[PDB]
Amino acid sequence: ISSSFSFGGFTFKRTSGSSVKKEEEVLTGNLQTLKIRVHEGYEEFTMVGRRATAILRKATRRLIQLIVSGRDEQSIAEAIIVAMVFSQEDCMIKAVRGDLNFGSGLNPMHQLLRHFQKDAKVLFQNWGIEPIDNVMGMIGILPDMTPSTEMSLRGVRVS
């Protein structure tokens, strides 16, 4: 473990890789120009929350893989939201549908998080899906947060 921090009520422990923060300007789906510290590099984490856990593999503004384990669908959705925000993917940025400011949180990453925690339907809808293969212990999760053995949110599996 080369780093431990908390984000969105999950403890992230970095198990591999590294990154450097670079300030960058992005345009939200509400057409707000935001300055964010983009994490540049490939990293793997375990995420541990009160009600769910996950493995997250990610690179610069890119979710590679997320395998989530939770008690119920709500708990799994929470982990998925945090991971999608933390990924900094432009898809997630473009799913934003209101203004973000200090009203929402102390930095833009928290503002984005709070935005999607209120309502993740546009995020989940716009993220993308993919067919999946069969793997013991794992299943797909659709945008409406129901399970599927056939398709899943892009890069996401439930254990």
XYZ file of N, CA, C and O in Angstrom:
636
model
N 0.861 -1.235 0.000
C 0.000 0.000 0.000
C 0.873 1.253 0.000
O 1.627 1.489 0.951
N 0.761 2.061 -1.056
C 1.619 3.247 -1.223
C 0.875 4.563 -0.961
O 1.428 5.634 -1.146
N -0.386 4.469 -0.554
C -1.198 5.646 -0.262
C -2.511 5.166 0.370
O -3.024 4.096 -0.005
N -3.019 5.925 1.345
C -4.348 5.687 1.930
C -5.051 7.046 2.166
O -4.499 7.935 2.806
N -6.275 7.178 1.661
C -7.054 8.395 1.805
C -8.518 8.028 1.696
O -8.885 6.911 1.266
N -9.358 8.977 2.072
C -10.804 8.800 2.081
C -11.390 9.713 1.057
O -10.971 10.867 0.952
N -12.344 9.199 0.303
C -13.088 10.001 -0.675
C -14.485 9.430 -0.794
O -14.638 8.187 -0.964
N -15.499 10.302 -0.668
C -16.909 9.885 -0.804
C -17.317 8.800 0.187
O -18.200 7.987 -0.065
N -16.669 8.827 1.331
C -16.933 7.873 2.409
C -16.337 6.494 2.208
O -16.779 5.549 2.860
N -15.387 6.376 1.274
C -14.670 5.173 1.010
C -13.217 5.438 1.338
O -12.643 6.441 0.953
N -12.612 4.496 2.014
C -11.152 4.470 2.100
C -10.548 3.787 0.889
O -10.843 2.598 0.600
N -9.642 4.509 0.245
C -8.918 4.081 -0.926
C -7.531 3.711 -0.468
O -6.851 4.499 0.214
N -7.091 2.519 -0.825
C -5.732 2.132 -0.546
C -5.110 1.814 -1.878
O -5.594 0.942 -2.600
N -4.044 2.523 -2.219
C -3.404 2.311 -3.504
C -2.436 1.145 -3.431
O -1.507 1.152 -2.618
N -2.671 0.175 -4.300
C -1.958 -1.101 -4.272
C -0.966 -1.128 -5.411
O -0.060 -1.944 -5.437
N -1.102 -0.240 -6.377
C -0.130 -0.244 -7.426
C -0.216 1.053 -8.167
O -1.267 1.719 -8.203
N 0.903 1.416 -8.764
C 0.937 2.557 -9.642
C 1.155 3.868 -8.921
O 1.391 3.950 -7.724
N 1.057 4.922 -9.681
C 1.213 6.227 -9.107
C 0.608 7.248 -10.042
O 0.244 6.950 -11.177
N 0.456 8.450 -9.522
C -0.012 9.533 -10.362
C 0.543 10.868 -9.917
O 1.010 11.020 -8.783
N 0.417 11.827 -10.811
C 0.749 13.205 -10.569
C -0.485 14.076 -10.865
O -1.209 13.827 -11.834
N -0.714 15.084 -10.047
C -1.850 15.956 -10.178
C -1.494 17.070 -11.144
O -0.424 17.679 -11.024
N -2.384 17.331 -12.093
C -2.191 18.408 -13.058
C -3.487 19.229 -13.143
O -4.588 18.699 -13.359
N -3.385 20.523 -12.920
C -4.594 21.333 -12.965
C -5.010 21.397 -14.419
O -4.155 21.529 -15.285
N -6.293 21.189 -14.688
C -6.830 21.190 -16.061
C -8.240 21.735 -16.064
O -8.983 21.611 -15.095
N -8.608 22.329 -17.184
C -9.897 22.921 -17.340
C -10.806 21.914 -18.055
O -10.400 21.308 -19.062
N -11.989 21.664 -17.498
C -12.965 20.811 -18.162
C -14.323 21.498 -18.274
O -14.648 22.413 -17.519
N -15.105 21.012 -19.216
C -16.433 21.566 -19.460
C -17.487 20.542 -19.077
O -17.576 19.484 -19.692
N -18.311 20.896 -18.111
C -19.388 20.030 -17.668
C -20.508 19.922 -18.697
O -20.580 20.713 -19.661
N -21.377 18.927 -18.507
C -22.583 18.808 -19.314
C -23.570 19.947 -19.067
O -24.565 20.041 -19.779
N -23.313 20.805 -18.081
C -24.115 22.011 -17.886
C -23.433 23.237 -18.496
O -23.858 24.363 -18.265
N -22.349 22.989 -19.197
C -21.550 23.980 -19.863
C -20.832 24.915 -18.904
O -20.505 26.043 -19.256
N -20.497 24.409 -17.713
C -19.640 25.128 -16.786
C -18.185 24.726 -16.987
O -17.840 23.540 -17.126
N -17.321 25.726 -17.101
C -15.905 25.457 -17.228
C -15.335 25.321 -15.832
O -15.385 26.279 -15.085
N -14.819 24.134 -15.473
C -14.310 23.853 -14.116
C -12.822 23.595 -14.154
O -12.335 22.947 -15.082
N -12.098 24.074 -13.141
C -10.672 23.758 -12.998
C -10.576 22.616 -12.019
O -10.981 22.758 -10.869
N -10.067 21.486 -12.484
C -9.894 20.311 -11.638
C -8.441 19.868 -11.648
O -7.701 20.091 -12.658
N -8.035 19.242 -10.541
C -6.764 18.580 -10.480
C -6.938 17.166 -11.021
O -7.474 16.256 -10.332
N -6.477 16.984 -12.248
C -6.568 15.711 -12.899
C -5.397 14.829 -12.429
O -4.241 15.287 -12.436
N -5.705 13.591 -12.055
C -4.706 12.583 -11.680
C -4.211 11.829 -12.920
O -4.966 11.143 -13.631
N -2.925 12.013 -13.203
C -2.309 11.494 -14.391
C -1.483 10.302 -14.025
O -0.466 10.445 -13.305
N -1.869 9.140 -14.556
C -1.201 7.887 -14.307
C -2.134 6.719 -14.099
O -3.348 6.894 -13.892
N -1.570 5.511 -14.149
C -2.318 4.269 -13.961
C -2.165 3.904 -12.499
O -1.032 3.882 -11.986
N -3.282 3.613 -11.838
C -3.297 3.242 -10.421
C -4.369 2.223 -10.152
O -5.410 2.203 -10.824
N -4.116 1.376 -9.176
C -5.063 0.416 -8.683
C -5.263 0.666 -7.219
O -4.311 1.024 -6.525
N -6.509 0.491 -6.761
C -6.938 0.732 -5.416
C -7.886 -0.376 -4.932
O -8.570 -1.050 -5.718
N -7.925 -0.576 -3.622
C -9.033 -1.220 -3.023
C -9.829 -0.066 -2.409
O -9.245 0.927 -1.989
N -11.157 -0.147 -2.442
C -12.012 0.848 -1.853
C -12.804 0.135 -0.793
O -13.381 -0.930 -1.065
N -12.849 0.723 0.399
C -13.619 0.171 1.488
C -14.499 1.207 2.133
O -14.011 2.181 2.705
N -15.793 0.985 1.999
C -16.786 1.842 2.573
C -17.463 1.160 3.737
O -17.186 -0.011 4.058
N -18.415 1.872 4.322
C -19.206 1.303 5.401
C -20.055 0.110 4.935
O -20.320 -0.792 5.701
N -20.478 0.120 3.668
C -21.466 -0.850 3.187
C -21.119 -1.560 1.870
O -21.868 -2.412 1.364
N -19.949 -1.282 1.332
C -19.530 -1.922 0.094
C -18.011 -1.829 0.023
O -17.395 -1.004 0.727
N -17.429 -2.693 -0.797
C -16.015 -2.662 -1.124
C -15.823 -2.820 -2.614
O -16.721 -3.298 -3.321
N -14.655 -2.445 -3.124
C -14.380 -2.619 -4.536
C -12.875 -2.666 -4.792
O -12.088 -2.272 -3.936
N -12.542 -3.178 -5.963
C -11.248 -3.065 -6.601
C -11.498 -2.095 -7.740
O -12.417 -2.287 -8.489
N -10.626 -1.104 -7.872
C -10.650 -0.083 -8.913
C -9.308 -0.019 -9.633
O -8.259 0.165 -9.018
N -9.352 -0.225 -10.925
C -8.180 -0.005 -11.800
C -8.511 1.188 -12.677
O -9.581 1.244 -13.299
N -7.620 2.164 -12.703
C -7.926 3.368 -13.470
C -6.685 3.977 -14.043
O -5.610 3.759 -13.538
N -6.855 4.811 -15.064
C -5.753 5.569 -15.575
C -6.221 7.011 -15.736
O -7.216 7.418 -15.132
N -5.510 7.799 -16.522
C -5.812 9.222 -16.595
C -7.205 9.385 -17.202
O -7.454 8.980 -18.335
N -8.109 9.941 -16.415
C -9.516 10.191 -16.840
C -10.134 8.975 -17.510
O -10.873 9.114 -18.460
N -9.872 7.784 -16.957
C -10.287 6.556 -17.568
C -10.521 5.522 -16.496
O -9.601 5.216 -15.724
N -11.764 5.026 -16.382
C -11.990 3.812 -15.561
C -11.664 2.573 -16.388
O -12.200 2.378 -17.484
N -10.788 1.719 -15.883
C -10.442 0.503 -16.571
C -11.272 -0.669 -16.096
O -11.861 -1.369 -16.910
N -11.300 -0.886 -14.789
C -12.097 -1.906 -14.184
C -12.572 -1.534 -12.784
O -11.805 -0.987 -11.981
N -13.816 -1.902 -12.473
C -14.347 -1.753 -11.142
C -15.120 -3.029 -10.814
O -16.071 -3.356 -11.498
N -14.686 -3.723 -9.767
C -15.362 -4.894 -9.279
C -15.878 -4.559 -7.894
O -15.078 -4.312 -6.982
N -17.197 -4.548 -7.737
C -17.782 -4.066 -6.515
C -18.533 -5.188 -5.789
O -19.126 -6.072 -6.408
N -18.476 -5.145 -4.475
C -19.162 -6.099 -3.612
C -19.968 -5.274 -2.624
O -19.438 -4.350 -2.010
N -21.267 -5.545 -2.476
C -22.084 -4.808 -1.509
C -23.267 -5.593 -0.966
O -23.611 -6.605 -1.523
N -23.881 -5.099 0.105
C -24.985 -5.794 0.795
C -26.227 -5.820 -0.085
O -26.933 -6.837 -0.170
N -26.463 -4.693 -0.760
C -27.658 -4.491 -1.564
C -27.374 -3.506 -2.717
O -26.262 -2.955 -2.838
N -28.393 -3.259 -3.515
C -28.227 -2.484 -4.733
C -27.868 -1.043 -4.420
O -27.021 -0.473 -5.106
N -28.475 -0.483 -3.366
C -28.195 0.908 -3.004
C -26.705 1.084 -2.682
O -26.083 2.067 -3.101
N -26.157 0.129 -1.925
C -24.747 0.161 -1.497
C -23.782 0.012 -2.672
O -22.746 0.696 -2.736
N -24.137 -0.849 -3.614
C -23.373 -1.056 -4.826
C -23.403 0.239 -5.685
O -22.360 0.676 -6.129
N -24.593 0.839 -5.832
C -24.760 2.130 -6.564
C -23.865 3.214 -5.998
O -23.215 3.882 -6.770
N -23.809 3.359 -4.667
C -22.958 4.327 -3.984
C -21.475 4.205 -4.371
O -20.816 5.189 -4.607
N -20.983 2.979 -4.391
C -19.587 2.680 -4.724
C -19.326 2.980 -6.177
O -18.289 3.561 -6.532
N -20.276 2.636 -7.012
C -20.165 2.888 -8.432
C -20.103 4.393 -8.681
O -19.203 4.853 -9.387
N -20.964 5.157 -8.030
C -20.941 6.636 -8.187
C -19.584 7.248 -7.787
O -18.932 8.014 -8.563
N -19.094 6.850 -6.629
C -17.811 7.350 -6.184
C -16.699 6.982 -7.150
O -15.859 7.814 -7.471
N -16.678 5.741 -7.607
C -15.632 5.309 -8.512
C -15.697 6.088 -9.871
O -14.673 6.479 -10.434
N -16.905 6.329 -10.377
C -17.088 7.022 -11.669
C -16.603 8.473 -11.509
O -15.913 8.976 -12.392
N -16.963 9.133 -10.396
C -16.447 10.485 -10.121
C -14.930 10.518 -9.965
O -14.216 11.301 -10.631
N -14.426 9.596 -9.149
C -13.006 9.527 -8.906
C -12.248 9.267 -10.227
O -11.128 9.713 -10.347
N -12.828 8.523 -11.184
C -12.195 8.198 -12.470
C -11.922 9.488 -13.249
O -11.024 9.497 -14.071
N -12.695 10.535 -12.960
C -12.583 11.831 -13.728
C -12.876 11.717 -15.187
O -12.534 12.621 -15.976
N -13.577 10.660 -15.585
C -13.885 10.421 -16.993
C -14.673 11.580 -17.577
O -15.556 12.119 -16.932
N -14.391 11.932 -18.824
C -15.173 12.998 -19.404
C -16.661 12.648 -19.569
O -17.499 13.519 -19.490
N -16.961 11.376 -19.759
C -18.332 10.932 -19.719
C -19.087 11.377 -18.442
O -20.241 11.812 -18.496
N -18.429 11.247 -17.292
C -19.018 11.610 -16.015
C -19.164 13.148 -15.946
O -20.210 13.670 -15.522
N -18.135 13.856 -16.367
C -18.161 15.333 -16.438
C -19.361 15.847 -17.299
O -20.030 16.803 -16.923
N -19.558 15.208 -18.448
C -20.615 15.544 -19.393
C -22.006 15.111 -18.960
O -23.001 15.567 -19.535
N -22.093 14.299 -17.911
C -23.384 13.912 -17.362
C -23.939 14.902 -16.348
O -25.070 14.776 -15.953
N -23.113 15.848 -15.895
C -23.450 16.884 -14.908
C -24.589 17.742 -15.487
O -24.537 18.056 -16.639
N -25.617 18.034 -14.696
C -26.791 18.745 -15.187
C -27.181 19.944 -14.312
O -28.275 20.471 -14.424
N -26.268 20.429 -13.494
C -26.476 21.719 -12.862
C -25.170 22.382 -12.558
O -24.087 21.871 -12.902
N -25.257 23.519 -11.879
C -24.073 24.276 -11.559
C -23.354 23.697 -10.344
O -23.981 23.285 -9.394
N -22.037 23.681 -10.378
C -21.254 23.264 -9.231
C -20.512 24.472 -8.662
O -19.833 25.215 -9.384
N -20.619 24.642 -7.356
C -19.896 25.687 -6.656
C -19.736 25.224 -5.222
O -20.112 24.079 -4.911
N -19.228 26.106 -4.354
C -18.932 25.746 -2.957
C -20.176 25.360 -2.167
O -20.059 24.711 -1.120
N -21.352 25.771 -2.659
C -22.635 25.258 -2.178
C -22.686 23.741 -2.146
O -23.194 23.164 -1.187
N -22.126 23.116 -3.185
C -22.078 21.657 -3.359
C -20.947 20.948 -2.625
O -21.014 19.745 -2.410
N -19.879 21.659 -2.308
C -18.721 21.026 -1.727
C -17.489 21.884 -1.808
O -17.463 22.917 -2.448
N -16.437 21.429 -1.168
C -15.305 22.283 -0.919
C -14.316 22.383 -2.098
O -13.607 23.397 -2.261
N -14.251 21.316 -2.885
C -13.534 21.315 -4.137
C -14.366 20.677 -5.209
O -15.413 20.116 -4.919
N -13.946 20.821 -6.465
C -14.838 20.352 -7.502
C -15.109 18.845 -7.453
O -16.216 18.415 -7.772
N -14.119 18.058 -7.078
C -14.340 16.610 -6.924
C -15.444 16.283 -5.928
O -16.298 15.448 -6.217
N -15.489 16.975 -4.785
C -16.615 16.806 -3.887
C -17.931 17.366 -4.414
O -18.945 16.806 -4.136
N -17.892 18.464 -5.168
C -19.078 19.015 -5.759
C -19.680 18.042 -6.761
O -20.903 17.867 -6.843
N -18.836 17.430 -7.570
C -19.308 16.461 -8.540
C -19.917 15.286 -7.831
O -21.028 14.814 -8.150
N -19.225 14.842 -6.800
C -19.717 13.721 -6.060
C -21.121 14.015 -5.487
O -22.057 13.204 -5.607
N -21.259 15.168 -4.840
C -22.543 15.475 -4.230
C -23.622 15.601 -5.269
O -24.749 15.160 -5.026
N -23.290 16.178 -6.434
C -24.242 16.249 -7.543
C -24.803 14.863 -7.924
O -26.022 14.661 -7.999
N -23.912 13.883 -8.137
C -24.348 12.592 -8.562
C -24.966 11.756 -7.445
O -25.766 10.872 -7.730
N -24.613 12.040 -6.202
C -25.231 11.313 -5.081
C -26.686 11.682 -4.959
O -27.480 10.832 -4.635
N -27.035 12.930 -5.287
C -28.453 13.355 -5.285
C -29.282 12.599 -6.326
O -30.409 12.192 -6.043
N -28.727 12.442 -7.532
C -29.367 11.759 -8.646
C -28.327 11.306 -9.683
O -27.693 12.137 -10.349
N -28.140 9.991 -9.806
C -27.145 9.410 -10.691
C -27.728 8.908 -12.000
O -27.022 8.322 -12.784
N -29.028 9.101 -12.254
C -29.626 8.508 -13.450
C -28.945 8.937 -14.742
O -28.776 8.107 -15.612
N -28.594 10.227 -14.903
C -27.971 10.673 -16.139
C -26.542 10.081 -16.268
O -26.140 9.602 -17.325
N -25.797 10.079 -15.175
C -24.500 9.407 -15.139
C -24.615 7.963 -15.625
O -23.888 7.544 -16.506
N -25.509 7.199 -15.005
C -25.633 5.784 -15.288
C -26.100 5.571 -16.700
O -25.581 4.695 -17.392
N -27.044 6.406 -17.148
C -27.530 6.329 -18.511
C -26.465 6.601 -19.566
O -26.419 5.912 -20.582
N -25.606 7.585 -19.322
C -24.665 8.047 -20.309
C -23.327 7.321 -20.256
O -22.542 7.489 -21.142
N -23.070 6.511 -19.223
C -21.755 5.900 -19.032
C -21.339 4.905 -20.142
O -20.163 4.874 -20.582
N -22.294 4.066 -20.536
C -22.136 3.080 -21.587
C -22.276 1.686 -21.009
O -21.992 1.465 -19.812
N -22.756 0.750 -21.829
C -22.833 -0.663 -21.421
C -22.058 -1.537 -22.388
O -21.537 -1.072 -23.388
N -21.891 -2.793 -22.032
C -21.067 -3.695 -22.771
C -21.567 -5.077 -22.482
O -22.047 -5.340 -21.396
N -21.461 -5.974 -23.460
C -21.734 -7.364 -23.155
C -20.626 -7.879 -22.266
O -19.543 -7.304 -22.249
N -20.907 -8.932 -21.518
C -19.962 -9.508 -20.635
C -19.823 -11.025 -20.873
O -20.682 -11.631 -21.499
N -18.726 -11.587 -20.389
C -18.484 -13.039 -20.310
C -18.858 -13.536 -18.935
O -19.024 -12.721 -18.014
N -19.012 -14.853 -18.810
C -19.388 -15.522 -17.572
C -18.103 -15.723 -16.763
O -17.113 -16.232 -17.296
N -18.129 -15.299 -15.493
C -17.028 -15.541 -14.551
C -17.546 -15.816 -13.151
O -18.365 -15.043 -12.618
N -17.049 -16.908 -12.562
C -17.475 -17.330 -11.236
C -17.337 -16.157 -10.293
O -16.406 -15.367 -10.406
N -18.298 -16.049 -9.385
C -18.298 -14.993 -8.403
C -18.774 -13.644 -8.918
O -19.036 -12.784 -8.082
N -18.905 -13.456 -10.253
C -19.247 -12.128 -10.846
C -20.508 -12.065 -11.729
O -20.946 -13.076 -12.299
N -21.074 -10.860 -11.827
C -22.301 -10.588 -12.592
C -22.216 -9.145 -13.116
O -21.378 -8.354 -12.637
N -23.047 -8.814 -14.101
C -23.159 -7.460 -14.600
C -24.201 -6.668 -13.816
O -24.991 -7.216 -13.003
N -24.143 -5.366 -13.977
C -25.077 -4.454 -13.318
C -25.475 -3.439 -14.387
O -24.642 -2.801 -15.013
N -26.785 -3.332 -14.615
C -27.299 -2.455 -15.653
C -27.385 -1.038 -15.125
O -27.343 -0.812 -13.948
N -27.596 -0.056 -16.017
C -27.757 1.347 -15.638
C -28.861 1.604 -14.639
O -28.737 2.528 -13.796
N -29.907 0.774 -14.649
C -30.971 0.923 -13.676
C -30.686 0.194 -12.331
O -31.567 0.092 -11.460
N -29.443 -0.275 -12.178
C -28.940 -0.987 -11.011
C -29.592 -2.365 -10.784
O -29.574 -2.857 -9.670
N -30.074 -3.015 -11.836
C -30.503 -4.396 -11.713
C -29.384 -5.297 -12.230
O -28.588 -4.853 -13.057
N -29.332 -6.557 -11.745
C -28.288 -7.458 -12.199
C -28.565 -8.097 -13.545
O -29.736 -8.272 -13.947
N -27.493 -8.420 -14.264
C -27.580 -9.063 -15.571
C -26.413 -9.996 -15.732
O -25.278 -9.667 -15.359
N -26.677 -11.193 -16.283
C -25.587 -12.088 -16.634
C -25.066 -11.809 -18.031
O -24.090 -12.421 -18.467
N -25.668 -10.852 -18.743
C -25.397 -10.679 -20.161
C -24.728 -9.361 -20.527
O -23.928 -9.329 -21.427
N -25.048 -8.290 -19.809
C -24.550 -6.968 -20.120
C -24.177 -6.289 -18.820
O -24.565 -6.743 -17.740
N -23.423 -5.190 -18.904
C -23.091 -4.441 -17.720
C -22.674 -3.033 -18.090
O -22.303 -2.773 -19.242
N -22.750 -2.154 -17.109
C -22.073 -0.867 -17.174
C -20.615 -1.150 -17.592
O -19.986 -2.079 -17.105
N -20.130 -0.341 -18.520
C -18.801 -0.445 -19.103
C -17.746 -0.488 -18.009
O -17.674 0.423 -17.168
N -16.941 -1.544 -18.022
C -15.882 -1.708 -17.047
C -16.290 -2.158 -15.639
O -15.419 -2.348 -14.793
N -17.585 -2.304 -15.375
C -18.081 -2.558 -14.046
C -18.589 -4.007 -13.920
O -19.312 -4.499 -14.797
N -18.229 -4.670 -12.835
C -18.792 -5.991 -12.506
C -19.081 -6.036 -11.049
O -18.468 -5.290 -10.274
N -20.026 -6.903 -10.651
C -20.409 -7.041 -9.264
C -20.014 -8.451 -8.816
O -20.186 -9.420 -9.551
N -19.489 -8.554 -7.610
C -18.859 -9.794 -7.182
C -19.834 -10.480 -6.258
O -20.402 -9.792 -5.402
